Amino acid sequence: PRAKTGVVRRRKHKKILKLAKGYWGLRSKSFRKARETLFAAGNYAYAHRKRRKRDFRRLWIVRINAACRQHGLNYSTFIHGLKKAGIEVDRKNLADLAVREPQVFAELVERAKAA
């Protein structure tokens, strides 16, 4: 029995090219340049999944820090105040509070400055 390539290799390539849809020039059209682009795009996705977690925190901080500089203190002191006050709530993700719930945010400043 001879088993020649037949259907197999075409399907393999088709799979990758589907994944490459939308890439520029040959990178979507050619099984190789597609495959090469994907290697990148797969390690970037993993890298940026790790670093989406960093990217968001940095934004929350800039926003927290911005809002309590409005009430006259640092970010750095504010966090200490909350560490003191036991208020390990904030989970910097809730600068949702800082924007939508200003008076909730202000009461947190106060609880913070008592230390």
Binding site: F56, L59, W60, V62, R63, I64, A66, A67, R69, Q70, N93, A95, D96, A98, V99, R100
Partner: protein, 137 residues
């Protein structure tokens, strides 16, 4: 739960006297304002942030010997085309420009950082266009 992002805000306006303020220390602040990093809805990709008007440039003061000793450089594409302009000569020729170049160098690079610069309007001495709003320092 998704992080909040503004819809279209309206631009606030500000006015700064700059007489006797130093330079980089004034520039720092103008930078953060231009970015909008005081507003605690600040977002990096948007251009939500104050326009800034500055009067009494030419009246910025600087420490050290920098008026004689600090040189700005400009390279033309051409051989020997590096020009060296000492600070005092700039102020005597195009005052402002000295703040403008100080704030430009302190805004982020890119298409957006290049727009924020467009929102900084710097004049020598007093006055300006009057039809916006403008609180103070």
């Amino acid at each position: 739960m998704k992080t909040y992002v503004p819809k279209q805000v309206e631009p606030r306006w500000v006015l700064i006297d700059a007489e006797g303020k130093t330079l980089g220390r004034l520039a720092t602040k103008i930078a953060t304002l231009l970015r909008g990093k005081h507003r605690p809805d600040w977002t990096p990709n948007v251009a939500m942030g104050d326009f800034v008007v500055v009067v009494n440039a030419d009246k910025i003061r600087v420490t050290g010997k920098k008026l004689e000793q600090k040189i700005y450089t400009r390279y033309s594409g051409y051989p020997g085309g590096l020009k060296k302009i000492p600070l005092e000569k700039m102020l005597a020729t195009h005052p402002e420009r000295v703040l403008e170049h100080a704030v430009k160098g302190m805004l982020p690079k890119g298409p957006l950082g290049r727009r924020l610069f467009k929102r900084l309007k710097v004049y020598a001495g007093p006055d300006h266009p009057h039809q916006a709003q403008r609180p103070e320092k």
